C-alpha cells in the first residue's frame, strides 16, 4: 500500500525522462492485492493522475502522438478501475471530460477520444447514468451542442451527434427535462442542414429533437405547434434536395407523424373538436401531401410492391385531414382506375384500406356504390396475382364500413346488395387456393357478419369433406356463419362438419386443430352448438356473455379541451349428435394417447387436447345439458386427466437434469398454454368452468415438481444509453422459463382457493414465499427483482384475502428493495405500480390483530418515504403519477382515513389531505390525473355518499388548492392548463356529488368573472 503512495509522490515531481519510467511502473504495478486494497483510494490516484496530465500538457505530429498515448493511458486507467464495478467518483470525471472537450487547444483526435470515452464508459453505466444531476445534464448538452455547430467538419461530428442524442435521452428520462428555450438551438442546426449538403449526423440530431418534443409536448403545446410551423418547411426542402437515404427519411417521417399527432389529437378535424389550426399549418399539410404523393411513385418507397406501413399511416392521416384542387375520394378512384401496372396500384389500395379502417366516416355514402364498382373490376382475374390480397382486404374494410351505417337509401341498398352478391360469386371460386386462404375467408366473414349475402347450400359443402383443412380464418368464418344462419339438414351435414373439425388420419399425422393455436373457447363453442337443437340460438347465447406510446398524451390533450369526458358518461341437445361428438372426441384422445412416445410427440399437443376436452365439458356445463358433479365422472374427464399425467413426464425429466438447453422452448410453450387455460375472473362464464375443470385436472406431483424446478432455477447462478435493469435482454432462456413457471404457479394458487383440488394451495404458497427469503434473495440481481415484482403483482387477491403473515412476508424485503433503487426513476415507477396491488389485502380489518397493524405500518412508512422524497423535488413526473395512483388506491381502500395515515418527520398526515396537494403540481398530466380521480373523496367507491362535513371540507380544500395554482402568477399554455384543471375539478364535483351541486355551481359562477374562465368552455361543460 505504501509503495503506491511513494510512487505517486515521486510522480508528483517533474523529471526530464524518469517520468516515463514512473509511468511504465504505474501501468505495470496494478496487481490483485493493490486492487483489493483500493476498495473503499481511487480518488487520490485519479487526482494525482490529473496532476500529471496537467503538468504534461503544460510542457504537431509528435504532440499529436503524445496526446494519443496519454489518452490511451487515461482510457486504460478508466477501464481498469471500473472493470469489476463502478467505483470511481463520477462528478470529478465529468468535470475532467468537460474541461478537456471545451477548450480547442487540444487536438481534434484527442477531443474525439475523450468524447468516445465519455460515450462508452460513462453513459453506458447505469449508476453513473442515474446519479447525474440536472445541472450537469444541461451544461453537458450546451457544451456538446455548441461544439456541433462549429464549422470544423471532420469524422467526429457524427459521433458528437450521438453524444447529444444520449444526453438528450438522459435529460428527458432522469430529470425534469430541458427548458423550452433550448428549442432554438435545434432550429439553428436545421438551418445549417438547409445549406450543408453532406449532412453528417442529422439522423441523431433529429431523433434527439423527436425525444425532446415527445417530452415537452405535454406542456407548451402551442409552443411546439409554432416550432413545427417554423421548422417543417425546411425539412420538406431537405427531403426534396437531399440524397434520400434510409435512416434520415425514417426519422423525418416519424417527426412528421408526431407533429400531426400533436396538431390533430386522434383525428380532430376541426378547431371546435380539439384541433389546432393555422394557415401555415394548412399550407404545410398540402405541401406534405404533395410530397408524399410524389414519394409513393418510387421504387425505394417499397420482389416486394407493398409500401412501408409508416408511410401508409402518415398518408392516411394527411388524407383524412385534407379530404372534405378538390382532393377527395375521386382522386383515389381515378388512381385506381387509371393505373394498369400492379406496381402503381397496390399503394393506393393500401391507402384506401387504411383510410377506411381508421376513419370509417371519411368515405361518404354516395361514393360507396362507385368504389365497389371499381374494386369488383380488379378482382375477377382468373389467375390470382400479387395484387389480389390487397383488393380482398380493401373489400373487407368496405364491407365492415358499410355494416356500421344505418342511413342508406333503398335504391343504394339494392345496388349494394347486387354488387355484394356479384363479388361474392367471383370471390367464391378460387377458394381452394390456399395461397390467399387467410384473406378470402375473412372477406366472406365481413359479408356474412353484415348479412350482405344470403348463404346458399354450396357454401356449407366447403367446410365438409377434404376441400379445405381447418384453420383459424376458416373457423372464424364458420362461427360467423353459425351466428347468423341456419344449418340446412341436407344430421348428415352437422355430423359432416363435426367430422371435418375432428378429422384425424387413421394410422402419426396429428390433426391440424392440435397443431395450430386457436382463440380460447372457439372450437368447443362450435362443437357444442352443433349438437344443440337450436344451433343459432346456442351460438348467440355463447356470444352474448359479458366481457370480463403517444396515445395517452393525445387523450390528455382531448381532456384539456373538454372534448372527451370519461366521467359523466332452456336449451335441449340431440342425444345422437352428443353421443357422436363424445365418441369422436374420445377416439381422437385415445389415438393421441396410445401413440404417445417419450420423445417423438410434442408436449403442447397433449395440453391442447386436454384443454379442448375440458372446454367442451365446461361449455356443456354452462347450459343445462350436463351437471357439475356427474361431469367429473365422464370418460372425457378421465381421458383428459390421463393426457395431463402423460404430459407431466417432460416436467419430471427436466427436473431430473436442468442443464439441458433444447427442452426449454417446449416447456415455455406448454407453460404459456397452461397459463392461458386458467382464468381468475368470476362472472359465470364457460371460461370459468373450463378453468375450474383444468385446475382440477392437475395433480400434486406435477405442482411439486414445478415448484422444485422454480427453486432450482432461482438458486442457479444498438441502444443509446444505459440499459434498464428490468430490460428483457438481461434475461436468458432459463430465466424466461422460470418466470413463466412462476406466473403459472401464482395463478394456480390464486384460483385454487375458490374450488377444491388434489394438491394443497397452502403448501405451494409457502414454497413460493420461500423464494423471497431474506437469506436467499438479493435485490441487486435482475432475475430476483423480476421474481419479487411478479410475486407482488400476482399473489394478493381481493376475493380471497391472504393470511396476514403472508402479507408480512411479502412486505418484509420491500424496504431494502426500494433502498437499492432509490436513484432509478424507472425502477421506482415500476415498484410503485406493482406495490399498489397489495392495498386490496391490506385494507381488510376483520382480523385486526397485531399483524395487521405491523403490515399497515410497513407499507405506510414506505409510502410516506416516497411522498417525503417527492416533496423535495427528487422524482420525475412518472414516479409522481405512480404515487398518485397508489394514493388513489389507498383512498379507495379506507375512505375515512381510519388507518391510512402517512407518518414522516414525527408528524402524521391523513391521505385525503395529502391527495388534494397534487392539484398544484408543476406537470399538467399529474394535475389532470388528480383532478379526474378527485371523485374518490366524495363517494365510498366500494356508492353511498360521505358525511356532509367531510364533503364540504374536501370541496373547499380542493377548490382552494386549484385557486392557489393559478394565484402564483408567451405563457398562455400554463394559464390554459390551470384553467382546464379548475374546470375539470368543478365538473367532476358536479357529476359525482349531488350534495355539492349548488356549491360547485356558485364556485363556477364566481370563477367566470374572477378567474377569467372562458364562457364558452364552461357553457359546453354545463351543457354536457
Amino acid at each position: 500500500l505504501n509503495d503506491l503512495l511513494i510512487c505517486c509522490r515521486q510522480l508528483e515531481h517533474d523529471r526530464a525522462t524518469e517520468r516515463k519510467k514512473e509511468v511504465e511502473k504505474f501501468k505495470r504495478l496494478i496487481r490483485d492485492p493493490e486492487t483489493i486494497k483500493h476498495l473503499d483510494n481511487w480518488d487520490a490516484v485519479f487526482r494525482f493522475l490529473q496532476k500529471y496530465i496537467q503538468k504534461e500538457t503544460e510542457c504537431q505530429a509528435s504532440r499529436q502522438k503524445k496526446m494519443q498515448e496519454i489518452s490511451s493511458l487515461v482510457k486504460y486507467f478508466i477501464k481498469c478501475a471500473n472493470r469489476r464495478a463502478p467505483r470511481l467518483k463520477c462528478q470529478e470525471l465529468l468535470n475532467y471530460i468537460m474541461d478537456t472537450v471545451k477548450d480547442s487547444s487540444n487536438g481534434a483526435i484527442y477531443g474525439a477520444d475523450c468524447s468516445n470515452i465519455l460515450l462508452k464508459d460513462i453513459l453506458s453505466v447505469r449508476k453513473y447514468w442515474c446519479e447525474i444531476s440536472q445541472q450537469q445534464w444541461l451544461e453537458l448538452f450546451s457544451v456538446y451542442f455548441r461544439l456541433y455547430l462549429k464549422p470544423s467538419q471532420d469524422v467526429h461530428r457524427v459521433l458528437v451527434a450521438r453524444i447529444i442524442h444520449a444526453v438528450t435521452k438522459g435529460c428527458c428520462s432522469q430529470t425534469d427535462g430541458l427548458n423550452s428555450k433550448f428549442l432554438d438551438f435545434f432550429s439553428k442546426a436545421i438551418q445549417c442542414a438547409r445549406q450543408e449538403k453532406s449532412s453528417s449526423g442529422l439522423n441523431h440530431i433529429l431523433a434527439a429533437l423527436t425525444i425532446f418534443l415527445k417530452t415537452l409536448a405535454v406542456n407548451f403545446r402551442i409552443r411546439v405547434c409554432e416550432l413545427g410551423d417554423e421548422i417543417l418547411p425546411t425539412l420538406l426542402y431537405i427531403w426534396t434536395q437531399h440524397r434520400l437515404n434510409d435512416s434520415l427519411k425514417e426519422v423525418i417521417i416519424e417527426l412528421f407523424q408526431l407533429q400531426i399527432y400533436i396538431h390533430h389529437p386522434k383525428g380532430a378535424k376541426t378547431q371546435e373538436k380539439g384541433a389546432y389550426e393555422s394557415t401555415k399549418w394548412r399550407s404545410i399539410l398540402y405541401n406534405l401531401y404533395d410530397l408524399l404523393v410524389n414519394e409513393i411513385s418510387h421504387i425505394g418507397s417499397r420482389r416486394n410492391i407493398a409500401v412501408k406501413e409508416n408511410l401508409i399511416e402518415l398518408m392516411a392521416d394527411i388524407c383524412h385531414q385534407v379530404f372534405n384542387i378538390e382532393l377527395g375520394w375521386e382522386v383515389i378512384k381515378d388512381h385506381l382506375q387509371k393505373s394498369q401496372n400492379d406496381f402503381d396500384l397496390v399503394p393506393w389500395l393500401q391507402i384506401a384500406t387504411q383510410l377506411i379502417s381508421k376513419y370509417p366516416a371519411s368515405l361518404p355514402n354516395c361514393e360507396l356504390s362507385p368504389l365497389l364498382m371499381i374494386l369488383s373490376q380488379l378482382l375477377p382475374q382468373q389467375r390470382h396475382g400479387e395484387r389480389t390480397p390487397y383488393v380482398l382486404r380493401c373489400l373487407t374494410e368496405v364491407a365492415l364500413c358499410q355494416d356500421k351505417r344505418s342511413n342508406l337509401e333503398s335504391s343504394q341498398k339494392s345496388d349494394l346488395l347486387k354488387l355484394w352478391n356479384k363479388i361474392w360469386c367471383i370471390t367464391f371460386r378460387g377458394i381452394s387456393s390456399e395461397q390467399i386462404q387467410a384473406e378470402n375467408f375473412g372477406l366472406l366473414g365481413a359479408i356474412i357478419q353484415g348479412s350482405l349475402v344470403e348463404v346458399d347450400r354450396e357454401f356449407w359443402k366447403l367446410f365438409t369433406g377434404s376441400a379445405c383443412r381447418p384453420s383459424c380464418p376458416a373457423v372464424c368464418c364458420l362461427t360467423l356463419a353459425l351466428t347468423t344462419s341456419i344449418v340446412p339438414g341436407t344430421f348428415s351435414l352437422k355430423e359432416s362438419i363435426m367430422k371435418w373439425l375432428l378429422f384425424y388420419q387413421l394410422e402419426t399425422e396429428v390433426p391440424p386443430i392440435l397443431h395450430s393455436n386457436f382463440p380460447h373457447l372457439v372450437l368447443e363453442k362450435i362443437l357444442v352448438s352443433l349438437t344443440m337443437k337450436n344451433c343459432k340460438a346456442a351460438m348467440n347465447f355463447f356470444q352474448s356473455v359479458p366481457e370480463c406510446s403517444f396515445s395517452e398524451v393525445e387523450e390528455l390533450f382531448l381532456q384539456t379541451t373538454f372534448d372527451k369526458m370519461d366521467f359523466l358518461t332452456g336449451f335441449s341437445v340431440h342425444q345422437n349428435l352428443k353421443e357422436s361428438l363424445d365418441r369422436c372426441l374420445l377416439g381422437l384422445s385415445e389415438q393421441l394417447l396410445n401413440n404417445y412416445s417419450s420423445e417423438i410427440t410434442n408436449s403442447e399437443t397433449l395440453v391442447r387436447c386436454s384443454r379442448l376436452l375440458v372446454g367442451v365439458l365446461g361449455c356443456y356445463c354452462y347450459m343445462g345439458v350436463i351437471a357439475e358433479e356427474e361431469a367429473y365422472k365422464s370418460e372425457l374427464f378421465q381421458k383428459a386427466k390421463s393426457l395431463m399425467q402423460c404430459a407431466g413426464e417432460s416436467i419430471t425429466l427436466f427436473k431430473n437434469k436442468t442443464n439441458e438447453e433444447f427442452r426449454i422452448g417446449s416447456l415455455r410453450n406448454m407453460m404459456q398454454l397452461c397459463t392461458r387455460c386458467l382464468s381468475n375472473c368470476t362472472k359465470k362464464s364457460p371460461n370459468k368452468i373450463a378453468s375450474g375443470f383444468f385446475l382440477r385436472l392437475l395433480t400434486s406431483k406435477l405442482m411439486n415438481d414445478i415448484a422444485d424446478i422454480c427453486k432450482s432455477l432461482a438458486s442457479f447462478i444498438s441502444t443509446i444509453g444505459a440499459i434498464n435493469p428490468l430490460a428483457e435482454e438481461y434475461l436468458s432462456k432459463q430465466d424466461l422459463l422460470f418466470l413463466d413457471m412462476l406466473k403459472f404457479l401464482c395463478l394456480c394458487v390464486t384460483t385454487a382457493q375458490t374450488n377444491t383440488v388434489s394438491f394443497r394451495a397452502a403448501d405451494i404458497r409457502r414454497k413460493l414465499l420461500m423464494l423471497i427469503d431474506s437469506s436467499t434473495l438479493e435485490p441487486t440481481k435482475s432475475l430476483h427483482l423480476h421474481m419479487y415484482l411478479m410475486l407482488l403483482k400476482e399473489l394478493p387477491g381481493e376475493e380471497y384475502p391472504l393470511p396476514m403473515e403472508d402479507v408480512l412476508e411479502l412486505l418484509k424485503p420491500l424496504s431494502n428493495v426500494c433502498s437499492l433503487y432509490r436513484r432509478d426513476q424507472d425502477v421506482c415507477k415500476t415498484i410503485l405500480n406493482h406495490v399498489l396491488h397489495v392495498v386490496k389485502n391490506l385494507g381488510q380489518s376483520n382480523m385486526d390483530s397485531e399483524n395487521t397493524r405491523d403490515a399497515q405500518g410497513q407499507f405506510l412508512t414506505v409510502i410516506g418515504a416516497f411522498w417525503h422524497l417527492t416533496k423535495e423535488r427528487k422524482y420525475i413526473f412518472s414516479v409522481r403519477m405512480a404515487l398518485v395512483n397508489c394514493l388513489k388506491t389507498l383512498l379507495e381502500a379506507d375512505p375515512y382515513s381510519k388507518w391510512a395515515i402517512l407518518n414522516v418527520m414525527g408528524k402524521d398526515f391523513p391521505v385525503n389531505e395529502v391527495f388534494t396537494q397534487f392539484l398544484a403540481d408543476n406537470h399538467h398530466q399529474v394535475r389532470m390525473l388528480a383532478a379526474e380521480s378527485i371523485n374518490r373523496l366524495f363517494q365510498d367507491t366500494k356508492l353511498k355518499a360521505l358525511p356532509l362535513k367531510l364533503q364540504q371540507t374536501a370541496f373547499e380544500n380542493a377548490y382552494l388548492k386549484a385557486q392557489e395554482g393559478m394565484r402564483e402568477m408567451e405563457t398562455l399554455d400554463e394559464i390554459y392548463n390551470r384553467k382546464s384543471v379548475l374546470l375539470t375539478l368543478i365538473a367532476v364535483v358536479l357529476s359525482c356529488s349531488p350534495i355539492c351541486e349548488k356549491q360547485a355551481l356558485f364556485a363556477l359562477c364566481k370563477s367566470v368573472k374572477e378567474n377569467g374562465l372562458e364562457p364558452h368552455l364552461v357553457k359546453k361543460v354545463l351543457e354536457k
Binding site: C818, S819, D854, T861, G864, A865, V904
Partner: peptide
C-alpha cells in the same frame, strides 16, 4: 439520507 425507507416500530 436513506433511513426513511426502513420501518421502525419503536
Amino acid at each position: 439520507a436513506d433511513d426513511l425507507f426502513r420501518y421502525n416500530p419503536y
